[PDB]
Every structure is written in C-alpha cells, then in structure tokens.
C-alpha cells in the first residue's frame, strides 16, 4: 500500500454524486497524472480514468476526474447499485517505481 489517501467508505441514495478525494506526495499525483480504478468484489479491477479525465473502453460517462496538482477528485453522478465496488485512486508513478494504488472506496446503498 502506497501513500494515496482515499475515503474507504462512501454511501448515498440512488441518483447522488459522490466526490472521491485523493492526495499524497507531489511525486505521486503532482508529477504523474492521476488515474482512477474500480474493482467489483471477487472480480478483476478495471481502469476508469487516465490522463486526469480520459476513459478507456467500457467506462460510463458518470465517472469523471479532475487533478489539482497533488489533489484529485473523482465525480460519479447518478448512483445505482453498480457502485458496490471499491474505487482506487492509482497511477504508475516514479515515487518508488510502481503502479501505486490507493485505499479503496467501497460503497453500499441504504
């Protein structure tokens, strides 16, 4: 586990907009662009955001990212039960020469 502070527990009604904040050292997020990931439980992870905003194939338009230097934000608008998964702020970084991962963001509905 690397120095990438992430809220481990999120919640909200279906249709809400969560904001996952991520911060750390400036060699992590200030240097390399922040990426965002999502892993469903007992499954494989998948990338959501690269280049601070851009998404790969298979990623919905609800997930949007922003980088303010060392700080970062993932906005996910219009929640449903698909967000029962831990979301990672990660990047390939040259801090300790690794694809450094975050603390997860697992959400449930109530």
């Amino acid at each position: 586990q690397s120095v990438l502070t992430q809220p481990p527990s999120a919640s909200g009604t279906p249709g809400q907009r969560v904001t996952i904040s991520c911060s750390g050292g400036s060699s992590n997020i200030g240097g390399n662009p922040v990426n965002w990931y999502q892993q469903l439980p007992a499954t494989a992870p998948k990338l959501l955001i690269y280049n601070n905003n851009q998404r790969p194939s298979g990623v919905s338009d609800r997930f949007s990212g922003s980088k303010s230097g060392t700080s970062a934000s993932l906005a996910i608008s219009g929640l449903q039960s698909v967000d029962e998964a831990d979301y990672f702020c990660a990047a390939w970084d040259d801090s300790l020469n690794g694809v450094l991962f975050g603390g997860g963001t697992k959400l449930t509905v109530l």
């Binding site: 400036s26 200030g30 230097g69 060392t70």
Partner: protein, 48 residues
C-alpha cells in the same frame, strides 16, 4: 513487437562527439520547480 520496417525503438542513441559542435554537444541542465501550496516555506536563509 519486433523492431523492423516502420517500427523503431522509442529511444535512439545520442550521437555525441568532440567533433560535434557546441549546439550538438550534451548540456547538463537543471530545472528547479517550486509550487506554492500551504506548507512551511522550506529553503530559506539568504535575507539577513
């Protein structure tokens, strides 16, 4: 995956010689980068 026709290595070697001119010579460079966030102003002394 192979290096061949229309597919070269992303890095090529420096051709650097003493016969090369000063514009075609290697320079040692440093980029001091600062960012103003709320933190202790770190490297501080030349003022008194």
């Amino acid at each position: 995956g192979v290096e061949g026709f229309n597919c070269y290595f992303p890095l090529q070697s420096y051709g650097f010689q003493p016969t090369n001119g000063v514009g075609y010579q290697p320079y040692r460079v440093v980029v001091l980068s600062f960012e103003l966030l709320h933190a202790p102003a770190t490297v501080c002394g030349p003022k008194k």
